[PDB]
């Protein structure tokens, strides 16, 4: 199916760490879609390099990082490995994503997070809206009962 639910034993411990490190429910929804374990132990850079490499629990790409975060603004494409610090600093990870979205606004943040630099050309394309929709649905689920902020339930969407 398009979407569903699964139990990830222990995940509620990591949910609470995220919410105790400056994250909000909206951040948890984005992280929940990105990885099953709310973790950073996917392949380095998510298998990608330079502006496309992904770091942190949200799999933020280096283009977004270097253009919209206080921690990385001004840095170059070639400096992309600097983003890896987010894989082991959850607070900086959370802070960077929030600053990125507060720099670009939600719509353009979605576009550049999903489609990189070329997504900023038009944030309202269907592939971006599909991603937006998925994060909205997961947030609606987490927001429907406070238990979902501390139990081991994961709401997932297959964003084709």
Ligand X SMILES: OC[C@H]1O[C@@H](O[C@H]2[C@H](O)[C@H](O)[C@H](O[C@H]3[C@H](O)[C@H](O)[C@H](O[C@H]4[C@H](O)[C@H](O)[C@H](O)O[C@@H]4CO)O[C@@H]3CO)O[C@@H]2CO)[C@@H](O)[C@@H](O)[C@@H]1O
Binding residue for ligand X, selected from 18, 33, 111, 128, defined by CB under 6 A: 33
CB 110 within 8 A of CB 123: yes
Interface size with ligand X, residues (CB under 6 A): 13
2 scored as a contact of ligand X (CB under 6 A):
no
Please, what sign has the CA dihedral across residues 53, 58, 63, 66? negative
Gap between the Cα atoms of 116 and 134, Å rounded: 18
Stretch that binds ligand X, among 28-36, 83-91, 121-129, 142-150 (CB under 6 A): 28-36
Please give the angle made by the CA atoms of 28, 66 and 15, to the nearest 5 degrees.
Answer: 15
110 scored as a contact of ligand X (CB under 6 A):
no
Tokens at 130, concatenated: 């599909």
142 scored as a contact of ligand X (CB under 6 A):
no
Gap between the Cα atoms of 155 and 119, Å rounded: 26
43 scored as a contact of ligand X (CB under 6 A):
no
Q: Least CB distance from residue 128 to ligand X, whole Å? A: 11
- Interface ranges with ligand X (CB under 6 A): 1, 4, 6, 33-36, 46, 59, 156-159
């Amino acid at each position: 199916a398009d979407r569903g639910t699964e139990t990830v034993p222990g995940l509620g411990q990591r949910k609470q760490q995220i919410l105790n490190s400056g994250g909000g429910v909206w951040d948890l929804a984005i992280a929940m879609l990105e990885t099953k374990n709310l973790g950073t132990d996917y392949v380095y850079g998510d298998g990608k390099t330079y502006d496309s490499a992904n770091f942190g629990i949200f799999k933020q790409n280096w283009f977004m990082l270097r253009t919209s975060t206080s921690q990385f603004k001004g840095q170059t494409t070639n400096q992309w490995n600097n983003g890896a610090v987010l894989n082991s600093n959850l607070q900086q990870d959370i802070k960077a994503r929030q600053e990125s979205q507060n720099y670009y606004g939600p719509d353009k943040w979605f576009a550049g997070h999903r489609n990189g630099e070329s997504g900023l050309s038009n944030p309202y394309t269907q592939d971006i809206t599909n991603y937006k929709d998925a994060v909205n649905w997961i947030h609606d689920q987490l927001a429907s009962d406070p238990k979902y902020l501390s139990d081991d339930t994961r709401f997932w969407v297959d964003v084709t």
